[PDB]
Design a binder for this molecule. Sequence first.
Ligand SMILES: N[C@@H](CCC(=O)N[C@@H](CS)C(=O)NCC(=O)O)C(=O)O
Ligand SMILES: N[C@@H](CCC(=O)N[C@@H](CS)C(=O)NCC(=O)O)C(=O)O
Lengths: 234, 234
Amino acid sequence: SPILGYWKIKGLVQPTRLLLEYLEEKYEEHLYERDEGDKWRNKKFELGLEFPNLPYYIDGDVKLTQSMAIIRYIADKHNMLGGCPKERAEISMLEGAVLDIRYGVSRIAYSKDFETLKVDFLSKLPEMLKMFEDRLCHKTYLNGDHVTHPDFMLYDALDVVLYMDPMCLDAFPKLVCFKKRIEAIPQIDKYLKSSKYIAWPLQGWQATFGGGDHPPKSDPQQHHLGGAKQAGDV
Amino acid sequence: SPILGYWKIKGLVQPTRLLLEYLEEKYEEHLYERDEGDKWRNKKFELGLEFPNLPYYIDGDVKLTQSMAIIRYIADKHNMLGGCPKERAEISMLEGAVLDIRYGVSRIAYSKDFETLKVDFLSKLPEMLKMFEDRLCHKTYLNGDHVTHPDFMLYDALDVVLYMDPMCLDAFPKLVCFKKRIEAIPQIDKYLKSSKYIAWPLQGWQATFGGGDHPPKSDPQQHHLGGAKQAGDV
Ligand SMILES: N[C@@H](CCC(=O)N[C@@H](CS)C(=O)NCC(=O)O)C(=O)O
Ligand SMILES: N[C@@H](CCC(=O)N[C@@H](CS)C(=O)NCC(=O)O)C(=O)O
């Protein structure tokens, strides 16, 4: 059975976990705890990875690193990347646009002066969310009536920014509905309430925002889940 | 002919320019000069782009944004993405590993503390480069006998880090050989010596590193390219 290795946090791999659950695909996870950085380093170069890094995905005759290569690989095995160059480009564009939001958070989540850097991030966020809001006019998912991996990437991004600003989706009803729609998918609903769900942290434990072993205050605001704030996976 | 829009700098789109030249695909560029930020802003939402941004690519079949969606699209139409999920994942992994280096630069290039932040980046750069050095063992290009888009992304990354650390490739003979081989490709040699080549800046003009109108002194480390330290185009 395939192995997905990463820190026991949402971070870069959460969208991949969501896609795997969405596809109801069987996989095992090697979860590195907060103080297991030493364990990681001792195995980093003994796994047969050509470009050692976290996350990594190992299955039948396939050893991969790079979060985006991994999530795209899983989608590709289920014929979800796109039927022609144009559609594949549309999917990669959506992908990159979600990354601008998600990485936008991580870019300043570890800074000592997060409280001041966010005011700017949150001022540029509406413009970014608006494009997804418009994309969803008459569309159930990004790309139409069918689910694609960027939907899970966007979901992850929405989950994270909601913590930073619980009201950032007030002017975007379609995005609110989108979030609920993903959570309403049977396999996802079950997963979010399961013991394998990792609700926190959002970033690496050391982060000023979305860090720590448990959700602090002035951030933990995002309804509809199952809990598991105390990690819970191993 | 397709239209490629971006600032008149290398930045996010240089690898794409290199790919188009390699393919000898005819294209036109809409280059935004140092002072044309408002020209861009006045047209940003008037081009039909679903996710307005720079770079943008427009042809008879699509209107795209997101640099990676664009370079992948061009590669996809030229049968360079991979024949199966395993190979496509390999390419995407190569792609992501190159981005850790290229974005590693961009993430600190605008900081006022660049000069110090680069210490940590340069400390980790050797390990990143080594992965590519090993990959090139017994291979002409990153994916073997045939060129793929990550080759041009890597070329761009090498060009850029050479400016930050002129000595960073000394311990990597394969990478130096690789860089010469890319510069040896007829279409690339011609491009690098043409008036369309934008040798500088590497980042936005306002960047601490790779900014300004011309390259700094002593640090310039990368030849086989046309002079025009400025830029020169339209
Ligand atoms: N571009 C890579 C980034 C990989 C990365 O930065 N991983 C960090 C955590 S966010 C890590 O702990 N890597 C393990 C290492 O550096 O050895 C990806 O998307 O997978
Ligand atoms: N993730 C995007 C980044 C796009 C981006 O942020 N572009 C910057 C230049 S590095 C820009 O000036 N965008 C135009 C804008 O924001 O209006 C990509 O890879 O294309």
